[PDB]
Paper text:
One of the leading targets for vaccine development is CMV glycoprotein B (gB), which is a viral envelope protein that mediates fusion with host-cell membranes and is required for viral entry into all known cell types. CMV gB AD-2S1 is a linear epitope at the N-terminus of gB (amino acids 68–81), which is extracellular, and is highly conserved across clinical strains. Within gB, antigenic domain 2 site 1 (AD-2S1) is a target of potently neutralizing antibodies, but gB-based candidate vaccines have yet to elicit robust responses against this region. To address this hypothesis, we examined the lineage maturation of a well-studied, potently neutralizing gB AD-2S1-specific mAb called TRL345.
To obtain high-resolution information on the binding of the early intermediate mAb I8 to the gB AD-2S1 linear epitope, we conducted crystallographic studies of TRL345.I8 antigen-binding fragment (Fab) in complex with the linear gB AD-2S1 peptide (65-HRANETIYNTTLKYG-79). A crystal in the space group P212121 with one complex per asymmetric unit diffracted X-rays to a resolution of 1.8 Å. Following molecular replacement and manual building of the model, the structure was refined to an Rwork/Rfree of 15.0%/17.4%. This high-resolution structure revealed hydrogen bonding between the side chain of Tyr78 of the gB AD-2S1 peptide and the side chains of VH Asn33 and Asn52a (both the result of improbable mutations), anchoring the C-terminus of the peptide in a pocket formed by Asn33 of VH CDR1, Asn52a and Asn57 of VH CDR2, and the VH CDR3 loop. The side chain of Glu69 of gB AD-2S1 hydrogen bonds with the side chain of Tyr32 of VH CDR1, anchoring the N-terminus of the peptide, and the side chain of Thr74 of gB AD-2S1 forms hydrogen bonds with the sidechain Ser98 and the mainchain of Val99 of VH CDR3. Interactions between gB AD-2S1 and the VL of 3–25 are recapitulated in the TRL345.I8 complex, with the side chain and main chain of Asn73 of gB AD-2S1 hydrogen bonding with the side chains of Tyr32 and Arg91 of the VL CDR1 and CDR3, respectively, and the side chain of gB T75 hydrogen bonding with the side chain of VL CDR3 Trp94. In all four complexes, the main chain atoms of gB AD-2S1 Thr75, Leu76, and Tyr78 and the side chain of Thr75 form hydrogen bonds with main chain atoms of the VH CDR3. However, whereas the side chain of gB AD-2S1 Thr74 hydrogen bonds with the side chain TRL345.I8 VH CDR3 S98, the side chain of Thr74 hydrogen bonds with the main chain of Cys98 of the 3–25 VH CDR3, the side chain of which forms a disulfide bond with Cys100B, stabilizing the longer 3–25 mAb CDR3 loop (the 3–25 VH CDR3 is one residue longer than TRL345.I8 VH CDR3). The structures of the peptides in all four complexes are highly similar, with an RMSD of 0.9 Å for 11 Cα atoms for TRL345.I8 and 3–25, 0.9 Å for 10 Cα atoms for TRL345.I8 and 8F9, and 0.4 Å for 10 Cα atoms for TRL345.I8 and KE5, despite numerous amino acid differences in the heavy chains at the binding interface.
Author numbering:
A (entry chain L): 1 to 95, 95A, 96 to 213
B (entry chain H): 1 to 52, 52A, 53 to 82, 82A, 82B, 82C, 83 to 100, 100A, ...
C (entry chain P): 69 to 79
Write the structure that this text describes.
């Protein structure tokens, strides 16, 4: 199949700035390259087809160019509604029709270090027989962050799950929640529960911890 | 006025079958080839299948060959996707999309797309959540929340103080546990000085199980 | 409406 590679994976820009998105094909697709926009919570929408032709009703700020293996999508001046995900798609050699992996256009802002909070399992949950420890990283930017769980100073790996909010509508930050899950029996075998947070806005990692039963 | 409306998505057990429908309006359905495309949670777009205007020419992604069948009923303006031997990896929103008009074949231009229908491949049974407090631990800012644990299927909604509290609220995407049940947290940051005076209640609604919970969260 | 080039012929 034709492999399409989109770079960068994330573009961080301010409204009103020019946006340039790249798509590269593993072999020539001629001009048979289209671009789709996917806004949060919506289906994709055709923007550009045949490398450079705007679809019906697409504003003039969207343009495309390229042939062979190298293509670009340009938004001359970003509007608020343009912060979205963009996919390229080739129709030169198919089946299968193939898509690039997508480029997210996000709002750029100043670096913000997370505020960190740790929550022990509730007594209510412990009565039911399980223990969830939660670590919250609140309102940080950019989205790259690392959570390291430690249990009596043993680094935990593979036994936690995390998720991240979409960019905040007011301050353009992200937030992250991580849950470490243990049986009640294993939870009661250890004392010190710690969430260690690394982020480029922190001069050194921030650790929030508690001692079980205090 | 071209419109495509998918239906039929739901929970289906691994190895079982499900048929999706796409109802077309606002154009001459029999004149157009039609596609299915899918999008796994948090992932990109994957083309699934195409069918010619008259139903005679069909093609499929390698990942669904031998398991999925595309078909259409032009008299009913409906496109179908019969999905057999479903696998966890088939979990996705499924979109129908109209193939751009061309002479003598398929174009491979997808325009427009429907709103999608969600297929969840799972052995889990419907189960309402347990709702546990994330209790606040200075003249500064405190965090508190609700852990909405062990429910199935998605989705759940969470509000705070019946919608009166929205500033500083973060309700996170659920995660799928190895049990096959989901877990979600919803938090809010508030003034530490408010903890003795202000009541904080998270309002959880898991509509698939008709389960509503109002959970007061106290220090 | 737009008429596109065919990229996959019918059988």
């Amino acid at each position: 199949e034709i492999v399409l590679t989109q770079s960068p994976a994330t573009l961080s820009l301010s409204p009103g700035e020019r946006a340039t998105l790249s798509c590269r094909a593993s072999q020539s697709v001629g001009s048979y390259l289209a671009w789709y926009q996917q806004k949060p919570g919506q289906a994709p929408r055709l923007l550009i087809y045949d490398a450079s032709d705007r679809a019906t009703g697409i504003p003039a700020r969207f343009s495309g160019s390229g042939s062979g293996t190298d293509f670009t999508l340009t938004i001359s001046s970003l509007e608020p509604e343009d912060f979205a995900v963009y996919y390229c798609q080739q129709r030169s050699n198919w089946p299968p029709l193939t898509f690039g992996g997508g480029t997210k256009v996000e709002i750029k802002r100043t670096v913000a270090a997370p505020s960190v909070f740790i929550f022990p399992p509730s007594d209510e949950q412990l009565k039911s027989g399980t223990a969830s420890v939660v670590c919250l990283l609140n309102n940080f930017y950019p989205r790259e962050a690392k959570v390291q769980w430690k249990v009596d100073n043993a680094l935990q790996s593979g036994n936690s799950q995390e998720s991240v909010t979409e960019q905040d509508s007011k301050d353009s930050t992200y937030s992250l929640s991580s849950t470490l899950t243990l049986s009640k029996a294993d939870y009661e075998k250890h004392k010190v529960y710690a969430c260690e947070v690394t982020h480029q806005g922190l001069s050194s990692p921030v650790t929030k911890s508690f001692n079980r039963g205090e | 006025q071209v419109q495509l409306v998918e239906s039929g998505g739901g929970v289906v057990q691994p190895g079982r079958s499900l048929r999706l429908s796409c109802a077309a309006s606002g154009f001459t359905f029999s004149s157009y080839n039609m596609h299915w495309v899918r999008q796994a949670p948090g992932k990109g777009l994957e083309w699934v299948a195409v069918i010619s205007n008259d139903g005679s020419n069909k093609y499929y992604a390698d990942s669904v060959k031998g398991r999925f069948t595309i078909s259409r009923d032009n008299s009913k303006n409906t496109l179908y996707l019969q999905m057999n031997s479903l696998r966890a990896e088939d979990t996705a929103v499924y979109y129908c999309a109209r193939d751009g008009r061309s002479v003598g074949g398929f174009s491979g231009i997808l325009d427009p797309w429907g709103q999608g229908t969600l297929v969840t491949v799972s052995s889990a049974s419907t189960k309402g959540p347990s709702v546990f407090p994330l209790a606040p631990s200075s003249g500064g800012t405190a965090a508190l929340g609700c852990l909405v644990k062990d429910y199935f299927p998605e989705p759940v909604t969470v509000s705070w103080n019946s919608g009166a509290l929205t500033s500083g609220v973060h309700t996170f995407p659920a995660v799928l546990q190895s049990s096959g049940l989901y877990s979600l947290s919803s938090v809010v940051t508030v003034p530490s000085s408010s903890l003795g005076t202000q009541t904080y209640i998270c309002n959880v609604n898991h509509k698939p199980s008709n389960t509503k919970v109002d959970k007061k969260v106290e220090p | 409406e737009t008429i596109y080039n065919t990229t996959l012929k019918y059988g």
